[PDB]
Amino acid sequence: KEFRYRGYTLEQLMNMSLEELAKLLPARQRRSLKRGLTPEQKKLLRKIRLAKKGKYNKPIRTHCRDMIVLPEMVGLTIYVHNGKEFVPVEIKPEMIGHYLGEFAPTRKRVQHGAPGIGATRSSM
Amino acid sequence: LSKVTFPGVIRLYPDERYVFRRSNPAIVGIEVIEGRIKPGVTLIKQNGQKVGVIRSIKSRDEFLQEAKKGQAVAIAIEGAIVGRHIHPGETLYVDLSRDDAITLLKHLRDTLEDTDIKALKMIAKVKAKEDPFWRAI
Amino acid sequence: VPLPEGNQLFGVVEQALGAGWMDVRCEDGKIRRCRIPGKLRRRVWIRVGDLVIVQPWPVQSDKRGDIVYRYTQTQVDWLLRKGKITQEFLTG
RNA sequence: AGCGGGGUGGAGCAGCCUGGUAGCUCGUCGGGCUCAUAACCCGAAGAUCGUCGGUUCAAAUCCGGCCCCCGCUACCA
RNA sequence: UUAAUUGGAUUCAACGCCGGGAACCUCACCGGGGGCGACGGCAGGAUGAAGGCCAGGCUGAAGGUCUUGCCGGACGCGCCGAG
Ligand code: MET
Ligand SMILES: [Mg+2]
Ligand SMILES: [Mg+2]
Ligand SMILES: [Mg+2]
Ligand SMILES: [Mg+2]
């Protein structure tokens, strides 16, 4: 009842080159990794590695909704912009291979009211 | 003073004896709980049915004029029938005018005593069902 | 949004009497035959059952008054939530 | 108090007597016609019969006990 | 309904219409961050105005600003009109 991703434990995923890991992800993630990371993602990754090393005792806030979750990011809490505020996300092992934006909804759930004037033919 | 009508709350005896005539008129004894009974005053229940207007009051064969606290009197009323309209042991309330209540609470505040204020307060509490005026008293 | 200031108070429209005359029930438990000023009569449509501000006439201030402002749905909802007025006054 | 009558969609009435589909008119919601409203046309929702029991192959229908409503009469403090 | 769900058009003669198949741009909306005042005049200014930067904080990221001191020589939005 441990975690496995394609028959690998978490540690085996930790000690992998970015290329070796890219062969396990779905096609969209593989193409995104092969084409390189954008500069903003580079800065975010630098901050993440610093925080893991034992420095940067501050919360991580980022505008990068298109960043792919990587195994070395597991255990940290990231604040992802949803359009008007930063929401906390706690990265769990079963999130590997997803974009960050999937965990920060940008619209509010709809609870309908009573239909107003002009909602039907007879109300006009 | 003559324009306003004094409040009053009474309760029918659960005794069969006090009923001396059923309809046209309804003759039944009564004891006063609070307030003052006067002739020509409409009575209503909690739900407000018009039981009619008190036609006459008599403590004995003699003709009376009014009844104060702690007095028993047989009322001959019109429009009230035992059973469908009134039941023995049921509590009856005097219908009140809001203008009369305002006059009593503001103008004629000198001539108000314990039984009168208790009756008026509980009548307002009971009548606080439809008009928020009695809810705010 | 504006609140009564002075002798003004709320009111609920009960029935329109024609020729710019309404019948408004106020907060002091009185029914008043109220007159609508023509300035707002032309541009604001009033219908039975609305929260409005009424100023009684200086002479005989018990049955006559003037309606000065109408409360929209958002304003009356905000007032109900704030608690300045209750629900049973509006619903009767 | 005694006697007589009655409870069925939101409303007012059939369907009983002769047990075996719960209908009629208005009303609400939706679509039609008209530049727009009313009138008119179409479709759908809505009672399982005041409750409880007995009878019957089977009960709103036959029977009985309760709850409520209506009418007539006796009834003078 | 919403932080915003940008606006115009309502019988024929509005409703795959605005050549309107909007990921960015378009874009007019919402949250946040930056920049701009010919020409006149006032403060000020080579005892250097205005302006620009290696590193490091602040930050979504930013010599934008701050810390740390280096670079540049003549105009000046800190003030009033005007554009
Ligand atoms: C009349 O008969 C009388 N005894 C009835 C009661 S008086 C309260
Ligand atoms: Mg029509
Ligand atoms: Mg629109
Ligand atoms: Mg598209
Ligand atoms: Mg866009």
Domain boundaries, chain A: 1-124
For strand E, is any atom closer than 7 Å to the CB of A41?
A: no
CB-CB under 8 Å, B132 with C89: yes
C-alpha–C-alpha distance, residues A53 and A68, integer Å: 20
Q: Find the CB nearest B98 among C29, C88, C89.
A: C29
Q: Would an 8 Å CB–CB cutoff place C89 in contact with chain B?
A: yes
Using a CB-CB cut-off of 8 Å, the residues of chain C touching B133 are 29
C-alpha–C-alpha distance, residues A64 and A82, integer Å: 10
**Structural method:** cryo-EM
Kindly report the length of chain A.
124
- Neighbour-count burial for A19-54, b at 16+ CB within 10 Å, e otherwise: eebeebbeeebbebbeeebeeebeebbebbeebeee
C-alpha–C-alpha distance, residues A91 and B75, integer Å: 85
Resolution to 1 decimal place, in Å:
2.7
C-alpha pair distances (Å), C54 with each of B6, B8, B53, C66:
34, 37, 39, 5
Q: What is the DSSP letter of B68?
A: -
d(CA A83, ligand 5 centre) in Å:
13
- Name the residue range of residue C60's domain: 1-92
C-alpha pair distances (Å), C11 with each of A14, B43, B133:
72, 32, 14
Strands B50-58 and B26-35: unpaired
Supply φ then ψ for residue A33, to 5 degrees.
-70, -40
CB-CB under 8 Å, B133 with C89: no
For strand D, is any atom closer than 7 Å to the CB of A120?
A: yes
Longest Cα separation, chain A? 68
Neighbours of C28 (CB within 10 A): 12
